[PDB]
């Protein structure tokens, strides 16, 4: 996809073609550009409370951000491009999937909890 | 996927192999065939209230329908096949994704609001 | 994906590389290994009540399991590898999708309701 809606529908996150995630309002106004990844961004997600955005990148990281664009964490450990990211329904854990078929589970404080499959 | 459940689980929408979307009840009985696309349908989605269906087609359009099968709107602007379509959680916006890596955001009345990436 | 969170976020199901589904707690600790498929597991899903897990396999079946690891049902009928499985939001139907573009709809007692497309 490369697009995610905030739970309240008021903010939309999109993976851009220039290594950023863009946040937009419902009227299609650009609100914020999230800069930090060092190659293409593939996947985006919002937390269930709507206050954190996750991004998944070809740079082999997942980054966590707030709505003001501040980088909160960089989740490092995948050995290939990360294409997918999702938050758990209670918002406390994050799953990430890389194109080498590895899935990792993290806490939001950035701790790797488990590699569910792969390396 | 090419399948979507209504939020109440009572209607199922499927992209068929014949340029249509089919609507089925929970017992697998056919309710409606949505006819109008001029080539393959790839993606389907329901609105959160369950009363509108969106379809994404190789004909480069997204169409919006009601449950009685009536065509409400055609969203034109993608320059390639549209594979994905999704409503926002509040139902007020619609994102569409084409295989040329373009994502467009529309309002619920079919107004194009923004091209989030691509052309 | 190959991963699904239970609706309450307390159990995580993942397709493993060894023909099993693994269930994990929120801390990443293994709870169960679901053994029975005779080749790779591709897709997993939870019922909306969180009490049943579905798995979709290269062995052309979907298996239904409980959180104690007991196999409850095997859904047979697809003539190719099953990659996707999903429960309806009310939990009364299951859709399965195989890589020959067939989608089947089943009830919760394992009755095939309809082949929505394909064979």
Residue numbers in the entry:
A (entry chain C), B (entry chain B), C (entry chain A): 7 to 125
Question: From the publication, what sentences describe this entry?
Answer:
β-Propellers offer an attractive model system to study this process. They are toroids formed by sequential supersecondary structure units of typically 40–50 residues, each consisting of four anti-parallel β-strands. The units are arranged radially, with their strands perpendicular to the plane of the toroid, and have a right-handed twist, hence the name ‘propeller’ for the fold and ‘blades’ for the repetitive units. Since none of our single-bladed PkwA constructs were folded, we turned our attention to another highly symmetric β-propeller of the WD40 family, found in the C-terminal part of Npun_R6612 from the multicellular cyanobacterium Nostoc punctiforme PCC 73102 and referred to henceforth as WRAP (WD40-family Recently Amplified Propeller; ACC84870.1). WRAP, which we identified during a systematic bioinformatic survey of β-propellers, was particularly interesting in that its 14 blades are practically identical, having acquired only 10 point mutations over 563 residues (6 of these being Trp → Arg mutations at the same position of blades 1, 3, 6, 10, 12, and 13), as a result of 13 non-synonymous substitutions at the DNA level.
For the 3-bladed construct, SLS data indicated a trimer, as also suggested by our crosslinking data. This result is in contrast to the aforementioned 3-bladed PkwA construct which formed dimers, pointing to a certain versatility in the way different fragments with the same repeat number can assemble. As we anticipated from their oligomeric states, the 2-bladed and 4-bladed fragments formed 8-bladed propellers and the 3-bladed fragment a 9-bladed propeller. Instead, the packing of the blades within each fragment preserves the geometry of the 7-bladed parent, and the tension due to the mismatch between the number of blades in the assembly versus that in the parent accumulates at the interface between the fragments. In the 9-bladed propeller, the symmetry mismatch is absorbed to equal extent at three interfaces, leading to a slightly triangular shape.
